[PDB]
Design a protein around this ligand. Structure first.
Ligand SMILES: C[C@@](O)(CCOP(=O)(O)OP(=O)(O)O)CC(=O)O
Ligand SMILES: C[C@@](O)(CCOP(=O)(O)OP(=O)(O)O)CC(=O)O
Lengths: 320, 320
């Protein structure tokens, strides 16, 4: 009485950010979002449901995870079991390769295999969405858009065809180590929706940002793409400074990196930064200028702190 | 054919920020503001109007100032001469003691003396306002409020009686040296008014902040004062991240200092930060905890970077 499955899902970085839920129960977002899936960072997850198990177990990189570390996985296991009318505890074994988007997407894929759900990419995106919003985009490779929809049935992601432009781009991660303890993405976006006087200004600008990203993609206009997404990310972070109590995901090193990206642009290197719910700074750059950018940034960051990535693929399912 | 006058004016730091003009010509503000005038930093200015002068001259700390460095002083000289129907060039000699608010306030006072304008404190505040908005508050000591008014006649500052509470407080300046070239306050607030999607959220919160500062003052409630003004400052800076193009006054060291103030609070030291249009971080603290705070911050900042100030007086006029 054992069912198992495995999947590999790559991380994605949002260029137009998801920030705030319209519906917490179903993870329907207040706004649509758009990301790039990356080759360098992914998660492999195997799930086993077994009648003989006595509790849910979650192992990450060989380390048994505690209740707090397992909360999103546990919530997802419960929702997928409820849907399938499955009454068995589960063991989840995940390995990160170098992580929230990729891990929940991989778990959704692994459960789809184990429980025989036979889901389409659309409906696998919808399932992954229930575990974590950003996870629903990692079902897809390259550029992907999460359409906010208005319901559980209409909120999901899809690949954005780009005439292979994504294969000419790169993201250079600047790994910043000097951060305060940060509000989680789930708690921070909720605080922002509920209390930030800047949130309406965020919402009022998302759709025209998305439209201009699509225009830039159709024309492979890198500076235009970069200007839109850099401003989008800064606007997202601006909202947390208007929350009550206000907060920031930035650390000192984040600001240092952002300032150096501006310097890089001033010295002829077209490149544009974005940040998520933490201090790391991701820099979008054309492949042809990646090495120039890495060398420039090495004047201030160690080679361990500068990790490159190219575009990556959508989810891969495996039978056990 | 020579007329001269002198004044000394102390700097002030806004606790509720002035950010954005309703009328650029007259420097009428979009919102009212509230500051504390400080003892440690001031400017002394002597002005001479003389029929024999061949151009306006501005000397600051013994250094002849160029056209860009003189622009606010030149604009003020022109407006005060036009009002007085004075046709003489002027020499302005200023010394900073340790600077925009204090320098323009001192110049307004010196011109009031030289040209025999015989202004009340209210009308001297109105005059100084035309040179720089923050200068109109340095006419007064202690706590001062700039009431936005609706006209040149109704926009001016006044002292806020506080039953001597201001004499129990201090500001510790953390002097941060790692800053990018920053947009001036005048240009940055204009860009924010004209382009920031967050500016309405700023405006919608100013008056209730002011009201709660007045309530806290009446009760000498330091944590309440501190919470309101820290959030006000962060909200002001949040608006620049929604401007087009977006920008920040923060440097890495600014973030480091803000994080350490939060740490100080966590370790039992009540203290609250605020920033203006630059990277320095000013920390409001009770006098009784100033030395504890300075020692704590010395773990990360040099003793030259930590400069204390207490409450200071209003403008002082001198005959030459
Ligand atoms: C800042 C972001 O990374 C937010 C990611 O939020 P999460 O997907 O972590 O939140 P939940 O839906 O609560 O699981 C921007 C983005 O990825 O779009
Ligand atoms: C951020 C602030 O310091 C803005 C000061 O602005 P200025 O008084 O420098 O601007 P102008 O009126 O154009 O001369 C906040 C404050 O002092 O209230």
């Amino acid at each position: 009485a054992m069912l198992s499955g495995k999947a590999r899902a790559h991380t994605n970085i949002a260029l137009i950010k998801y920030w705030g839920k319209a519906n917490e129960e179903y993870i329907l977002p207040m706004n649509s979002s758009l990301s790039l899936t990356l080759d360098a960072f992914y998660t492999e997850t195997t799930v086993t449901f077994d009648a003989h198990y006595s509790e849910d177990v979650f192992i990450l990189n060989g380390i048994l995870q505690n209740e707090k570390q397992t909360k999103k996985v546990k919530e997802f296991l419960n929702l997928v079991r409820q849907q399938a009318d499955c009454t068995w505890f589960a063991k989840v074994e995940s390995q990160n390769f170098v992580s929230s988007a990729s891990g929940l997407a991989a778990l959704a894929g692994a459960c789809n295999v184990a429980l025989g759900l036979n889901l389409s990419a659309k409906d696998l995106s919808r399932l992954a969405r229930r575990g974590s919003g950003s996870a629903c985009r990692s079902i897809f490779g390259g550029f992907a858009q999460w359409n906010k929809g208005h319901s559980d049935e209409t909120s999901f992601a899809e690949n954005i065809p780009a005439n292979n432009w994504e294969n000419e781009l790169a993201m250079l991660f600047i790994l910043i180590n000097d951060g305060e303890k940060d509000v989680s993405s789930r708690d921070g976006m909720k605080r922002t929706v509920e209390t930030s006087s800047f949130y309406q200004g965020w919402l009022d600008n998302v759709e025209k940002d998305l439209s201009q990203v699509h225009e830039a993609i159709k024309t492979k206009d890198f500076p235009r793409l970069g200007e839109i997404i850099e401003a989008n990310g800064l606007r997202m972070h601006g909202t947390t400074l208007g929350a009550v109590p206000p907060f920031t995901y930035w650390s000192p090193g984040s600001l240092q990196a952002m300032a150096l990206v501006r310097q890089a642009r001033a010295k002829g290197i077209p490149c544009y930064f974005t940040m998520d719910a933490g201090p790391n700074v991701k820099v979008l750059v054309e492949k042809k200028n990646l090495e120039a950018l890495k060398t420039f940034l090495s004047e201030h960051f160690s080679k361990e702190q500068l990790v490159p990535a190219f575009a990556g693929p959508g989810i891969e399912l495996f039978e056990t």
